[PDB]
Design a protein around this ligand. Sequence first.
Ligand SMILES: O=C(NCc1cccc(-n2ncc(-c3cc4cnccc4[nH]3)c2O)c1)Nc1c(F)cccc1F
Ligand SMILES: [Ca+2]
Ligand SMILES: [Cl-]
Lengths: 250, 58
Amino acid sequence: IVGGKVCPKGECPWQVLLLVNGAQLCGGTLINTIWVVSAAHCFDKIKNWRNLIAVLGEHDLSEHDGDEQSRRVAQVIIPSTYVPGTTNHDIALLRLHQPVVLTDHVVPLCLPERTFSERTLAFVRFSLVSGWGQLLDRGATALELMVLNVPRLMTQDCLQQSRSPNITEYMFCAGYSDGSKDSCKGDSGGPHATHYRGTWYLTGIVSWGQGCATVGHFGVYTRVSQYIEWLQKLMRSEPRPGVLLRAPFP
Amino acid sequence: LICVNENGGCEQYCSDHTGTKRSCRCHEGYSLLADGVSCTPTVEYPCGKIPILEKRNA
Ligand SMILES: O=C(NCc1cccc(-n2ncc(-c3cc4cnccc4[nH]3)c2O)c1)Nc1c(F)cccc1F
Ligand SMILES: [Ca+2]
Ligand SMILES: [Cl-]
């Protein structure tokens, strides 16, 4: 996250850190005690599918404070329509090997109904994006969880205001074009969370775009509303052997 | 009332019904109040609420 602030410990309790061989991979969002939403592209280059870990209740990566909860990733579910190394349909649903325990420091973000998200949430201007990504373009990653308030653009507006992957119906733009504030590498998969009447909801996933905090460009986010039904169906399904599962979309 | 407008007055989720009818609903871990619009937690850690903040205002 570029141009944000430290998320006070416990104020982003749905934030997930994904590790591969102990190394930072990506972010994610807890939506239930066993389910995490991330970005498909985070998994393009995974060798050993068995060495993926999700950490809940993380804050300062330099220390252990006892609020952290680590789980093995048992399933990584990606839409059939996602093509590695691209941008469209950049979403993954992860099943944890064992549930996390909800605590003051570990709480799911609400996965909204499609109608609600489309009719209402999509029109809330500002939303929060968070992660332990780069603090600057070509810069070091953050040790403490960072958060940033970004405004959402209608795609028409995004396109107009921008100056190379298309912006599809499965995406949305948010942020700033002045190169001051953005999500960045290391933040992918993390939440774009939207407040409505006292509750927070999952509306986007940090995807990937024009470097980070690049003048004349906005951050691109996966439009979660397009995937609600797909997610819900999968959460009702039995696990399958082998970590990676490609699931038909729609 | 209609759901497309002002969320049908619902705090959370809204469904249109046949006629001049609407029903509000709540996410798991919430229940709908008698006002027919408001949602109150039914569990300790409902989704989308920040405990340290909820306490901070409790
Ligand atoms: O290597 C592939 N995936 C492995 C991977 C894993 C974790 C992270 C990343 N990764 N690299 C850059 C960013 C990133 C830039 C950015 C800017 N703004 C916001 C968010 C942002 N995120 C990012 O998340 C990549 N795929 C692949 C392929 F399959 C084929 C060809 C090229 C390819 F890159
Ligand atoms: Ca820690
Ligand atoms: Cl496997």
